[PDB]
């Protein structure tokens, strides 16, 4: 079965690490960071990895029941699954599918319905994924809210993410840290079942990222968010399940107005892209440009320089 990537343009696609559109293609050096995101991870033959699931809108959402921490505006959420069943911590995954894969303060809204009468409520909420109480793999996360008495126990509650925050009285853009994984089971625990770190291995190459800007809700957050694969590529490979004929799919990025190739890149079968470039660079592309799979090559193929 022939392998393909979708014909959607970059701007027609969605970040796989937060529920926002893609904006641009970006390449840069990894530096002293290890790049190991857990959302937006899928092999080219359609095996989901890490915490990756298929829904573009369920990324960084949470569902469950909540309990008030007395005297505070904090609430503890006992996690349910995406369809309100019990969360199974025995599954060999790092954390529930769709769990945030970076350390930062994600602001959004906690909503709840009382099942007996259909009454509803909603409050500003922030989840700090570097917090000691961020333990999604154990089935519990804590939210800071703007209420101390308007959430009920034993009622379905959902967190919808909006954006990120930063304490402006502290060093600007010091958080989020997009390449720092949470400790999914809390302090002094060790993450397990992670999708692997990715890095270029060939001279002159860098990762190519699909970049968005997360909305900021307060302060001076670092809003950059790089994913390794658009969410639509995850969905496409999962359905197509085309076998990989080598370890590297050569893609050409084409301007359809001219038919001319802008650049070429390697889509590694384990689900990430490299390009021949060094340094930080926002790629200049026509907005109707698209990726086209052209041929299977090896790890020693030399790309045309970006």
Ligand X SMILES: C[C@@H]1O[C@@H](O[C@@H]2[C@@H](O)[C@@H](O)[C@@H](CO)O[C@H]2O)[C@@H](O)[C@H](O)[C@@H]1O
Residue 236 backbone dihedrals phi, psi, to 5 degrees = -65, -50
Position among 89, 130, 186, 219 found at the interface with ligand X (CB under 6 A): 219
Minimum Å gap between C-beta 100 and ligand X is 20
Given the complex with ligand X, which of 5 and 125 has the nearer CB atom? 125
For residue 158, the SS3 value is: strand
Distance CA 264, CA 148 (A): 54
**Structural contact between residues 180 and 38, judged by C-beta atoms closer than 8 angstroms:** no
Distance CA 231, CA 236 (A): 9
Position among 150, 201, 243, 295 found at the interface with ligand X (CB under 6 A): 150
Given the complex with a copy of itself, which of 19 and 200 has the nearer CB atom? 19
Q: Which does 162 bind (CB under 5 to 8 A by kind): a copy of itself, ligand X, none?
A: a copy of itself
Q: Which does 108 bind (CB under 5 to 8 A by kind): ligand X, a copy of itself, none?
A: a copy of itself
Q: Does 57 bind a copy of itself (CB under 8 A)?
A: yes
Q: How far is CA 76 from CA 21, 163, 189, in A?
A: 30, 20, 20
Minimum Å gap between C-beta 98 and a copy of itself is 11
Distance CA 101, CA 76 (A): 20
Of the candidate spans 87-95, 119-127, 224-232, 291-299, the one that interacts with ligand X by CB under 6 A turns out to be 119-127
Between residue 213 and residue 252, which ones bind a copy of itself under the rule CB under 8 A? Answer: 213, 215-221, 223, 232, 235, 239
Minimum Å gap between C-beta 188 and a copy of itself is 31
**Structural contact between residues 96 and 50, judged by C-beta atoms closer than 8 angstroms:** no
Torsion sign across C-alpha atoms 62, 64, 70, 71: positive
Distance CA 124, CA 122 (A): 7
Between residue 143 and residue 202, which ones bind a copy of itself under the rule CB under 8 A? Answer: 158, 160, 162-163, 165-166, 168, 172-173
Q: Which does 79 bind (CB under 5 to 8 A by kind): ligand X, a copy of itself, none?
A: none
Position among 120, 201, 245, 280 found at the interface with ligand X (CB under 6 A): 120
Distance CA 233, CA 103 (A): 25
**Structural contact between residues 73 and 147, judged by C-beta atoms closer than 8 angstroms:** yes
Q: 86: exposed, middle or buried (C-beta count within 10 Å: 0-12, 13-18, 19+)?
A: exposed
Minimum Å gap between C-beta 167 and ligand X is 5
Torsion sign across C-alpha atoms 42, 54, 229, 178: negative
Given the complex with ligand X, which of 121 and 133 has the nearer CB atom? 121
Give the single-character DSSP code of 279.
S
Q: Does 119 bind ligand X (CB under 6 A)?
A: yes
Q: Does 117 bind a copy of itself (CB under 8 A)?
A: yes
Between residue 18 and residue 47, which ones bind a copy of itself under the rule CB under 8 A? Answer: 19-21, 23
Q: How far is CA 141 from CA 5, 64, 137, in A?
A: 36, 10, 9
Residues at the site binding ligand X, with contacts judged by CB under 6 A: 119-121, 150, 167, 218-219
Residues at the site binding a copy of itself, with contacts judged by CB under 8 A: 6-8, 11-14, 19-21, 23, 54-58, 82-83, 107-109, 111, 113, 117-122, 124, 158, 160, 162-163, 165-166, 168, 172-173, 213, 215-221, 223, 232, 235, 239, 287
């Amino acid at each position: 079965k022939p392998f393909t990537v979708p014909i959607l343009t970059v701007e027609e696609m969605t970040n796989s690490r937060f529920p926002i559109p893609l904006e641009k293609l970006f390449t840069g050096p990894s530096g002293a960071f290890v790049v190991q995101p857990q959302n937006g991870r899928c092999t080219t033959d359609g095996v989901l990895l890490g915490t990756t699931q298929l829904s573009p809108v369920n990324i960084c959402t949470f569902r469950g029941d909540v309990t008030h921490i007395a005297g505070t505006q904090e609430y503890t959420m006992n996690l349910a699954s995406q369809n309100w069943n019990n969360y199974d911590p025995t599954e060999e995954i790092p954390a529930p599918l769709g769990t945030p894969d970076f350390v930062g303060k994600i602001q959004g809204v906690l909503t709840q319905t009382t099942r007996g009468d259909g009454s509803t409520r909603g409050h500003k909420a922030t989840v700090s994924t570097g917090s000691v109480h961020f333990t999604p793999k154990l089935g519990s996360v804590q939210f800071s809210t703007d209420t101390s008495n308007d959430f009920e126990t034993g009622q379905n509650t959902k967190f919808t993410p909006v954006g990120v925050v930063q304490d402006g009285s502290t060093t600007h853009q010091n958080e989020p840290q997009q390449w720092v994984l949470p400790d999914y089971s809390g302090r002094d625990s060790h993450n397990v079942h992670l999708a692997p770190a990715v890095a270029p291995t060939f001279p002159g190459e860098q990762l190519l990222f699909f970049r968005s800007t997360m909305p900021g809700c307060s302060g001076y957050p670092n809003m950059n968010l790089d994913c390794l694969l658009p969410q639509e590529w995850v969905q496409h490979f999962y359905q197509e399940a085309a076998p990989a004929q080598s370890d590297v799919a050569l893609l050409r990025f084409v301007n359809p107005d001219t038919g001319r190739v802008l650049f070429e890149c390697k889509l590694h079968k384990s689900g990430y892209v490299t390009v021949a470039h060094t340094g930080q660079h926002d790629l200049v592309i026509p907005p109707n440009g698209y990726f086209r799979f052209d041929s299977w090559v090896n790890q020693f193929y030399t790309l045309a320089p970006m």
